[PDB]
Amino acid sequence: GTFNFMIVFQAEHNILMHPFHQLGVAGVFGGALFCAMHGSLVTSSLIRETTETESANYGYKFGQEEETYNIVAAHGYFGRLIFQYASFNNSRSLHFFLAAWPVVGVWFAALGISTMAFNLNGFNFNHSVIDAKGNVINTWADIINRANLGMEVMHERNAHNFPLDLA
């Protein structure tokens, strides 16, 4: 039923072509990326507190006062992976970013659905490119349109009596 909702939504609002959903994707793709990033960087710089035969997780004790990884070493790594000023050396700023990126993106995703609720839809570039004579030169937007038309004509196949699906 979730997938049904998504496909029909695409047919009626062209959500893929809506910048708020695109922001949403940036939020979740980026949130996953930054999750893997932060996970890998902290894990990469754990201070040796255990033997080869035991899990490194026993190197941290719940409620210990000392930090369990070396952020300066993590920064020294990531700053060299890209460049120095592209990497965080402030943990508070780093974690704020981790909070803000997916949260803001998902806010925009929520707003996409909440504003397509009132039929302000994704960008429509159907037949936007025209040649000298006036022949329509299709773009990938028009191919998206053909897919959307397939969903539109088929959905709720017995529900429509009149030519326009107005809600």
Ligand X SMILES: CCCCCCCCCCCCCCCC(=O)OC[C@H](COP(=O)(O)OC[C@@H](O)CO)OC(=O)CCCCCCCCCCCCCCC
Extract the annotated binding site for a quinone.
Answer: 38, 87-88
Residue with tokens 């981790």: 98
| 99 phi/psi in degrees, rounded to 5 | -75, -50
The answer to the question of residue 166 lying near other proteins (CB under 8 A) is no
Residue with tokens 């897919």: 147
Q: Annotate each residue in 105-144 with x if it binds Cl ion (CB under 5 A) or - if it does not, as one string.
A: ----------------------------------------
**Distance between CA 93 and CA 4 in Å, rounded?**
40
Determine which residue in the list 9, 115, 121, 125 makes contact with other proteins, applying CB under 8 A.
125
Exposure on the CB side of residue 146, measured as CA atoms within 13 A: 6
Answer whether 145's CB lies under 8 Å from 152's CB.
no
**Ranges within 145-164 binding Cl ion (CB under 5 A):** 155-156, 160-162
Residue with tokens 């529900």: 159
The answer to the question of residue 63 lying near other proteins (CB under 8 A) is yes
The answer to the question of residue 149 lying near ligand X (CB under 6 A) is no
Determine which residue in the list 12, 71, 115, 121 makes contact with other proteins, applying CB under 8 A.
71
Minimum distance between the CB of residue 25 and other proteins, rounded to whole angstroms? 10
Nearer to Cl ion by Cβ, of 158 and 161: the residue is 161
